[PDB]
Symmetry: D2
Subunit: 260 residues, 4 copies
């Protein structure tokens, strides 16, 4: 702690995709740093188990991030549990691969739409509602009322063959950062975006080991899969450092994804 350093203790985090991978690690980091967390996930089993393991500072609320009504209910539950919302972290996402021209014809419109719905619409939906709650907070240190962190992907910059939908959704997340920051600046709410490279996600851990090790060796340095706790450490830094706003930060070991 030095003068403009923002304290993490006792701040209330709302976190999506919190039952696994990135979101799980953020929830763990937050609780261990002395914060409150409300876990949101569409999977009840995983979410209940996480909140259970983290203890009294955690709650879980089943949530389809793309739903208006679920989004509200998630806000209401966070307020009822902990009285306020200080930080939103959007980690819910899917990363499918589908060619524009595949063996069985054109990319399905439905699958494109669905990727957009979960990754981009879902992010916007939680963002708009969290923001509305955060704006009711009393202005804190430096006039700050909240911090919103979204998750894009290096696919927003280096999209591979088969990632039209994924790149479109994550590019959309990245490009919203600024206009949203610009508005929410009036209320003291910062808006930031992290663009991860290759991390040990559930999809990743599903692959055979030789394939996992090969992805890792594609990353210049460190030549390994990123650890979810490293994504969480960056989230922490964004909460603590008040000068970080309206920016997209690549967390990717210098990776630039080839076409194949």
């Amino acid at each position: 702690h030095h003068h403009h350093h923002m304290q993490i203790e006792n701040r209330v985090f709302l976190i999506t995709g919190a039952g696994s991978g990135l979101g799980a690690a953020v929830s763990k980091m937050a609780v261990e740093a002395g914060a409150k967390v409300v876990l949101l996930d569409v999977n009840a089993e995983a979410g209940e188990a996480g909140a259970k393991a983290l203890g009294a500072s955690a709650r879980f609320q089943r949530t389809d991030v793309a739903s208006d009504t679920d989004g509200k209910a998630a806000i209401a539950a966070a307020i009822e549990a902990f009285s306020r919302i200080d930080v939103l972290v959007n980690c819910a996402g899917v990363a499918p691969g589908e060619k524009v021209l595949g063996r069985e014809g054109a990319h399905k419109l439905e699958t494109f739409t669905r990727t957009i719905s979960i990754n981009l619409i879902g992010t916007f939906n939680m963002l708009r509602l969290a923001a509305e709650a955060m704006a009711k907070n009393e202005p804190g240190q430096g006039g700050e009322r909240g911090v919103i962190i979204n998750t894009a992907s290096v696919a927003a910059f280096d999209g591979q063959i088969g990632q039209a939908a994924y790149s479109a959704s994550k590019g959309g997340v990245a490009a919203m950062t600024l206009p949203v920051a610009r508005e929410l600046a009036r209320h003291g709410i910062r808006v930031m975006t992290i663009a991860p490279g290759i991390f040990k996600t559930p999809m990743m851990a599903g692959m055979p080991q030789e394939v996992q090790d090969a992805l890792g060796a594609s990353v210049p340095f460190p030549p390994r899969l990123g650890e979810p706790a490293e994504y969480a450490a960056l989230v922490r830094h964004i909460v603590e450092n008040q000068m970080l706003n309206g920016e997209v930060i690549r967390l990717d070991g210098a990776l630039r994804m080839a076409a194949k």
Copy 2:
């Protein structure tokens, strides 16, 4: 010019073609000796355009976000002119709505709609055009087609109230590379233009002092862009084979302020 790609006789498919940018692209294309199939949701405007352009033009009513309308539009282009060489996606809406507004949070429905038309619509026509283009015989330099999408400077310098618009156009911009990478195998190039402030129908609706003020925000030329200038760039992209997988800002050096 040896590797210069010829515009004459190529078949353009163009969305939002009943007005503004798409209208100017249609005009440019017909006057350079090409065929155009105009697509628009507004039948009156589209028919009138095709009528005015003459025998080299057809119109097909189309909701670009619809799977079935998209297919019908491809089928109509093939039936009329036998092939598709160029797709230009100009259909788009540019609404403003705050995240935290007078009536509460930004409506989810309005966000979703802006994404549907601007992004899902662009992807829909792209996927179906590409499929048709791949059936063409390889032409000059092995090229079978060119796809040109329209993003916006909002993809980079989004203003207060443009979350939806920036999201949709940022999505368009970010697709360019993964799509270009795949479609390279078929000789189909994929490019994106990011316009600044142009004399669109919404723009021409505004009172003159407001128009003039928007123009004076542009460093040089300090005016609204002319739709024919956007069309001139589209032409150059069709002609210049080295242009691929790139987003081009057409904006007089504008960098939009927050408000």
Copy 3:
């Protein structure tokens, strides 16, 4: 006909660096053939004379070290004396060396880094400042325009490979100047643009997604032409690269 805001290339005076070969030669050729005047600038007299000779009465040559204050001024004076004005500057002069930060003999030489910067970046800025000064004396033309400056960066500004610290630094510097320079020179009606070429000629093409070949210099020249003709292009860097994204190795 041609649209109202279309900018005509006929009779405009081009000043072109690195004009004795490659990209600059092809720009000089395009310009003369479209009815413009060209002043060719190059450090190599043999190549420059031969080019100007082959292009004819609409071309002149002036030997020039683009990084030199006094050579830069002499080049402006020679253009004015020959053709009375300057309407377009195209900076194509450049070197593209590869040298590792940590090499077999030791660290990257400071002298070689400095020299790459001097030719690619300082040289570009030098010709830009002096051309701009001359262009500002022109009467305002169509749409109030007095000139166009076009600089050459490289995809190395974005996807720099192992060994390209110097090259990437110099071309990144060119790319980043585009905006602050365009912002100022907007007052005088001078547009400022930058082209970032991929791999151009001088299986080597098979790394390029499409077209899977080396770029032709005349294609770079076609883009220059389009920039001069399209008045809404300003303050932007355009990648001309067949969708290439250079790997590290």
Copy 4:
């Protein structure tokens, strides 16, 4: 702290422009986190006073960062004092404003050249020499042998009227980050760049207070000058977070500089 977290304690920092502003704050942060610092600056009085105030964990070496011979002397002095170099932070920089076409004629070539010399050639010079020293270190945690952090500027993206030289130099720094990171990955040396917005620098503190306050009010949130300690906090997070590599981070309160 998590298993892949990189410890700052006992690492040796070499820092340029360390007598004032950003480099002084990085030195302070590093010493107070338990690290060693070698301060480099052209100004002896400021540098000695800094090293004096920081104590036994600090040394000062007078240095023109653009000089080959001074650069080498600096490396030798750091090795002789602390045996190794683990982190280089390049903060030495000048930020002049000069129009391309000014009231009294064209931008001087000498001034452009000088800004490039100090900001870009100087940064490259220290980098190449620090990298050479770092490569001799034994591979540490995660195989890492060093971290190099350069300072660009938001001028690399949003250059204002009068900033051709400054933008050119800082855009050059930014664009080197990837090709350097790609090579030095082989030796386990990470390379990162920070792009600061408006900070309380000595040039800034030289201005009258109304002009300061006005610059601060141009920043969306927080609407103030950035504190050098915040730039130092981000440096620290880069040294700690191993997945950060080959990237430029904007630290700017969502500022997008207007032309004027």
